[PDB]
Each structure stands twice: as C-alpha cells, then as structure tokens.
Design a protein around this ligand. Structure first.
Ligand code: HEM
Length: 85
C-alpha cells in the first residue's frame, strides 16, 4: 500500500488534487470530484480533512463501492490519523 502524510491530503484540498481520508484510506476522487451527484463542495469543503463519517453517514451505495475502490491510490499515515483517539 501507499502511505501518504497528512500533509498531502491538506495540500491536496484543491480541485487539482482532491483527496479525502476514508476509513484510513484517502480517496482521490479528483476526476469524480465534479462528477459527484451529491456535491462538489461536500467533498472539497472537507477533502484533505476527514469525510469518513460524512461519507459513511450519507451511506454510499454499492455503486460507490466500485468507484471508491477504483478511485483508490493508498492510505495516509495512520500514525497521525489517530490524533483524536
Ligand atoms: C471515493 C469517492 C466517492 C464516490 C465514488 C462517491 C459516490 C457516491 C454515489 C454513487 C452516490 C450515490 C447515492 C448515495 O450514496 O446516497 C453518492 C452520494 C453521496 N455522497 Fe458520495 N462518493 C464519494 C465521496 C464522497 C465524499 C467525500 C462525501 C463527503 C464529503 C460524499 C457525500 C455524499 C452524499 C452526502 C451523498 C448523497 C447526497 C445526495 O445525493 O444529495 N461522497 N456518493
């Protein structure tokens, strides 16, 4: 797997590179950023951030499962990820 620093998602909080920490796994939905039927902001607004709950809360359908996976590159340092815990 590919472990990215929390610094990434951050700098990657723009359209160019839209990342979102999902279940200890960043989702490069850059291409599917404006394609998102829900909203392009809901993603960006909290892209680099953590939209895990904001992603699971909405309850993504299988259709997403395929995409999400397809739009997977790797996870972010889970060391700084558990900064809350
Ligand atoms: C890997 C990237 C993502 C994919 C492939 C994806 C895919 C989808 C798909 C197919 C829908 C179907 C309907 C549903 O799930 O209820 C959806 C809905 C939704 N997604 Fe995502 N999603 C992604 C990331 C996100 C993120 C990061 C957020 C939040 C920040 C988000 C928020 C939502 C919301 C709120 C809905 C339904 C809202 C509505 O249609 O008004 N999604 N997503």
């Amino acid at each position: 797997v590919k472990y990215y620093t929390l610094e990434e998602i951050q700098k990657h909080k723009d359209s160019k590179s839209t990342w979102v920490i999902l279940h200890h796994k960043v989702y490069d939905l850059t291409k599917y950023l404006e394609e998102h039927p829900g909203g392009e902001e809901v993603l960006r607004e909290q892209a680099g951030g953590d939209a895990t709950e904001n992603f699971e809360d909405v309850g993504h359908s299988t259709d997403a499962r395929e995409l999400s996976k397809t739009y997977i590159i790797g996870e972010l340092h889970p060391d700084d990820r558990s900064k809350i815990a």
